[PDB]
Amino acid sequence: STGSATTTPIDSLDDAYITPVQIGTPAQTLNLDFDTGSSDLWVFSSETTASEVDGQTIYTPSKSTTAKLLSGATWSISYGDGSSSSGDVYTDTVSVGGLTVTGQAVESAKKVSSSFTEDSTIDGLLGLAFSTLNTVSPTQQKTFFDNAKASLDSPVFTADLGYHAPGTYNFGFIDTTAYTGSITYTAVSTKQGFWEWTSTGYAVGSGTFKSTSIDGIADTGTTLLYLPATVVSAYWAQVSGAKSSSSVGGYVFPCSATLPSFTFGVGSARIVIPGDYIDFGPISTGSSSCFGGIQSSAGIGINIFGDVALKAAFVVFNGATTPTLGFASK
Ligand SMILES: NCc1ccc(C(F)(F)F)cc1
Ligand SMILES: NCc1ccc(C(F)(F)F)cc1
């Protein structure tokens, strides 16, 4: 079997992407943030503290004939940005673009952090990292991808994110019309539970390509690109008036500047991120200082190939027994 669904930016800056997901019988459609950096499927629900819900669509397990409470199971998650949420667990039927999984763990949020309450457009997350990171206690639960793996024509899913435009998540097959040239595959380490790989280097604008191993994770759930300080300093040195602002918490640049592109290596192939992708607009309404989409990972402890990088490519998450990542230009 296969599945195909459209994913759409939540705002004019591509801060996140939402994808409709059907939960329960009869279907309740929620717009989830597909997150290859985490492994929990959790939703706003009828159980969420009422003051912490501000416009989200909620899952109501009492109205699903296939919902089963998972006795004694709880969950609690903290993300790298300080966000968090927690609650109890149901099993239910979940469908993504016509691909169905019965008995999927649906984690009902009882408590959510402020950043989630303020994002009216995201009803929950669908984690697509490896199941070892799932936070359900005392019995760990599998992700949607892991549960669907056996029924899929091929144990893969692909991420085709749009720049200021809708995109596609596909499960079970690789659309050979969605990219140009060849797909370059690279080895994945699962030892930390992430889609972790090693980039072979980078270039700034038309500059010389610098061969250097950059270890990082492919994370649809993270907006920006986070790379080591040396690389990020080399990029922003090419933008007149750019500087790192402690009060703003990152590199900023004059909104009137033109940004150079950024190239990152995948084996012997190159993925080029257009400079326009690196512009995240004014730091505040009316400001002439703009926020940059390439930031330092020094404070994070790991490099993150977030949406800024991934939307420049067609990306294959190959969940074979030896997992690999595929990158192609598009
Ligand atoms: N998108 C989920 C996510 C968020 C943060 C991290 C960090 F910070 F641990 F790298 C990993 C995964
Ligand atoms: N990396 C996972 C993640 C995704 C979205 C959010 C937001 F946007 F709700 F803050 C936080 C964390």
Swiss-Prot record:
Top-level class of the enzyme under EC nomenclature: hydrolase
Reaction(s) catalysed by this chain's protein: Hydrolysis of proteins with specificity similar to that of pepsin A, prefers hydrophobic residues at P1 and P1', but does not cleave 14-Ala-|-Leu-15 in the B chain of insulin or Z-Glu-Tyr. Clots milk
Disulfide linkage: C255-C290
EC identifiers of the protein: 3.4.23.22
Record GO terms (molecular function): aspartic-type endopeptidase activity
Segments forming domain Peptidase A1: 17-328
Keywords (A to Z) from UniProt: Aspartyl protease, Disulfide bond, Hydrolase, Protease, Signal, Zymogen
One Gene Ontology biological process: proteolysis
Family, similarity comment: Belongs to the peptidase A1 family.
Protein name, as recorded: Endothiapepsin
Record organism: Cryphonectria parasitica
Residues of the full protein shown: 90 to 419 of 419
